[PDB]
Amino acid sequence: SGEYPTVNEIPVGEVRLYQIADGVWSHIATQSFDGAVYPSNGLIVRDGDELLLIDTAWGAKNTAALLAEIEKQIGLPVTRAVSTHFHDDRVGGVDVLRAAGVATYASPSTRRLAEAEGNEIPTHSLEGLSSSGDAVRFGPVELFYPGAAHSTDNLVVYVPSANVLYGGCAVHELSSTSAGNVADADLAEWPTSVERIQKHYPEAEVVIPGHGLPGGLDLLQHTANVVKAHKN
Numbered sequence: 001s002g003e004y005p006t007v008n009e010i011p012v013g014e015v016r017l018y019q020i021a022d023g024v025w026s027h028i029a030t031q032s033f034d035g036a037v038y039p040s041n042g043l044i045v046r047d048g049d050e051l052l053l054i055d056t057a058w059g060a061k062n063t064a065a066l067l068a069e070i071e072k073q074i075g076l077p078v079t080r081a082v083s084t085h086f087h088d089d090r091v092g093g094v095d096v097l098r099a100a101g102v103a104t105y106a107s108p109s110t111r112r113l114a115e116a117e118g119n120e121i122p123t124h125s126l127e128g129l130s131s132s133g134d135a136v137r138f139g140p141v142e143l144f145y146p147g148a149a150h151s152t153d154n155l156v157v158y159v160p161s162a163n164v165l166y167g168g169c170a171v172h173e174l175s176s177t178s179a180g181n182v183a184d185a186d187l188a189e190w191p192t193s194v195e196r197i198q199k200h201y202p203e204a205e206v207v208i209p210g211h212g213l214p215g216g217l218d219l220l221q222h223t224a225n226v227v228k229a230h231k232n
């Protein structure tokens with residue numbers, strides 16, 4: 001009923017959208033992994049009379065449900081998708097998207113990692129993002145490579161019309177008491193990567209983590225703090 005939708009509020013398989021700003025939504029779904037249930041976020045950005053999707057809904061059936069929810073709530077076609085790293089909460093569902101007419105994109109680093117891991121593989125490669133601090137335009141967003149953090153390939157996404165910073169899994173929510181799933185992380189470089197984000201997007205008004213509740217710029221410093229303490 002208007003609050004940001006939370007893990008115990010979303011059955012696995014269902015998707016909810018949350019309006020962030022004019023022409024910007026997050027999508028929220030839940031999935032089981034190693035016997036526990038987790039929420040995850042993605043982004044939807046209006047691109048004229050089309051939509052740009054950022055990240056799948058973590059699984060094939062969740063992603064089909066995402067497309068249905070978008071049709072119900074927004075009613076514009078998803079034409080392109082970008083996955084912000086190689087893990088299943090970002091690319092699982094790419095095959096569904098690809099069969100629903102959506103052109104799927106990721107950096108070459110993400111595509112390689114996804115292939116090597118046996119995850120679904122976006123079709124198109126996003127060049128121009130291989131060095132930390134690189135930025136490129138993609139429809140109504142800017143894609144930014146901050147450096148290694150949650151993963152070596154993680155990208156963040158900025159919506160300049162709305163000053164929305166979608167951190168993906170490089171950014172944690174304010175309630176986080178740990179650094180999430182760090183299997184593929186670079187705990188030593190992560191704070192440096194976060195500092196790059198802070199420097200590059202000082203006017204962000206909303207910051208959206210890969211999992212959990214949006215907030216403001218404080219999510220960035222909080223993330224650095226939880227990662228440094230996890231490393232320590």
Ligand SMILES: C[C@@H](c1cccc2c(-c3ccc(NS(C)(=O)=O)c(F)c3)c(C(=O)O)[nH]c12)N1CC(CN2CC(N)C2)OC1=O
Nearest residue numbers: 033038087088089169172176177178179180181183210211
């Ligand atoms: C698919 C993905 C994955 C699965 C399950 C949970 C999470 C979590 C996660 C956990 C706790 C919290 N809450 S918190 C900050 O602790 O308070 C959180 F916000 C997120 C994250 C994240 O942190 O982004 N991601 C997850 N995977 C898989 C994976 C490594 N598997 C070995 C093989 N290489 C792939 O690595 C990863 O990320």
Ligand SMILES: [Zn+2]
Nearest residue numbers: 085087150169
């Ligand atoms: Zn991940």
Ligand SMILES: [Zn+2]
Nearest residue numbers: 089169210211
């Ligand atoms: Zn994640």
